[PDB]
Amino acid sequence: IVGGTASVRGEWPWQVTLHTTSPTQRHLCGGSIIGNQWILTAAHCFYGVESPKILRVYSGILNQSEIKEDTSFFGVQEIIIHDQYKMAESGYDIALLKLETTVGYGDSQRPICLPSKGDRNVIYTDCWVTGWGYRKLRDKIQNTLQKAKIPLVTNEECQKRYRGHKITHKMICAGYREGGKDACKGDSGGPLSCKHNEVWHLVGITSWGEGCAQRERPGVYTNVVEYVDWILEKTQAV
Numbered sequence: 688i689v690g691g692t693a694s695v696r697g698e699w700p701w702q703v704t705l706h707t708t709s710p711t712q713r714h715l716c717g718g719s720i721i722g723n724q725w726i727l728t729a730a731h732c733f734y735g736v737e738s739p740k741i742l743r744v745y746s747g748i749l750n751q752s753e754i755k756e757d758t759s760f761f762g763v764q765e766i767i768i769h770d771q772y773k774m775a776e777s778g779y780d781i782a783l784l785k786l787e788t789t790v791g792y793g794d795s796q797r798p799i800c801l802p803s804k805g806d807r808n809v810i811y812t813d814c815w816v817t818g819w820g821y822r823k824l825r826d827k828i829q830n831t832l833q834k835a836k837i838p839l840v841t842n843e844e845c846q847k848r849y850r851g852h853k854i855t856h857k858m859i860c861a862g863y864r865e866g867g868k869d870a871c872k873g874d875s876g877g878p879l880s881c882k883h884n885e886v887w888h889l890v891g892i893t894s895w896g897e898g899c900a901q902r903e904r905p906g907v908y909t910n911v912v913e914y915v916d917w918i919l920e921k922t923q924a925v
């Protein structure tokens with residue numbers, strides 16, 4: 688996160704750090720708890736990941752330093768990538784991780800609500816992007832979870848900022864015209880959380896952008912409301 692501040696412990700209890708074990712243990716992406724055995728993240732996080740065996744999901748973490756070999760984690764049973772996904776820039780950048788065990792809900796870990804179909808018309812004015820990603824283009828993964836309040840931008844406005852790309856309605860953008868606050872490397876897969884009627888909703892999944900917090904280059908996110916039926920399809924399978 689560029690231009691953000693340290694989160695308070697338990698502030699984003701749906702936020703997870705997805706670690707890889709191959710070749711060495713490192714943070715790979717962010718993600719969101721959406722169900723007791725379900726993590727919602729970005730499909731691009733899995734480039735070259737040949738097996739769910741190498742993945743470790745850590746919930747209830749504020750600081751990366753809390754993670755040692757003795758730290759409990761959730762194993763991944765299945766990686767479910769949208770079947771239309773080719774690359775982040777073309778959309779369908781959404782994936783589900785089915786966990787091997789159930790997340791026990793509490794004050795350190797709980798799910799975020801998905802947007803409602805009727806809420807495609809609501810205007811979100813209180814949106815926050817979180818993660819352990821870089822604070823500048825060339826940096827390192829941050830210890831403490833960072834947060835930044837970002838205004839949502841219309842698809843028309845986002846399309847002007849991305850000449851040569853096709854900003855679809857399955858994408859949602861967020862940023863300040865002058866830059867300064869944005870998601871950066873290592874934040875991808877994480878949430879874009881919006882509070883409306885005292886309830887937080889998973890509005891976006893950090894996906895892509897041209898650089899980090901640049902003027903007239905808003906962050907591009909998977910528009911979660913457009914995938915509620917695909918999520919229910921995969922999570923509510925008989």
Ligand SMILES: NC[C@H]1CC[C@H](C(=O)N[C@@H](Cc2ccccc2)c2cc(-c3ccc4[nH]nc(O)c4c3)ccn2)CC1
Pocket residue numbers: 713714715716731732733734820826827828869870871872873874875893894895896897898899900905906907
């Ligand atoms: N302004 C809007 C934003 C939107 C989000 C974008 C983003 O985050 N893209 C991802 C794409 C990806 C590539 C490979 C794996 C997973 C995701 C990314 C992540 C990293 C990364 C990840 C883990 C790491 N661990 N240690 C590291 O140093 C480190 C660096 C580096 C480079 N790109 C940046 C622009």
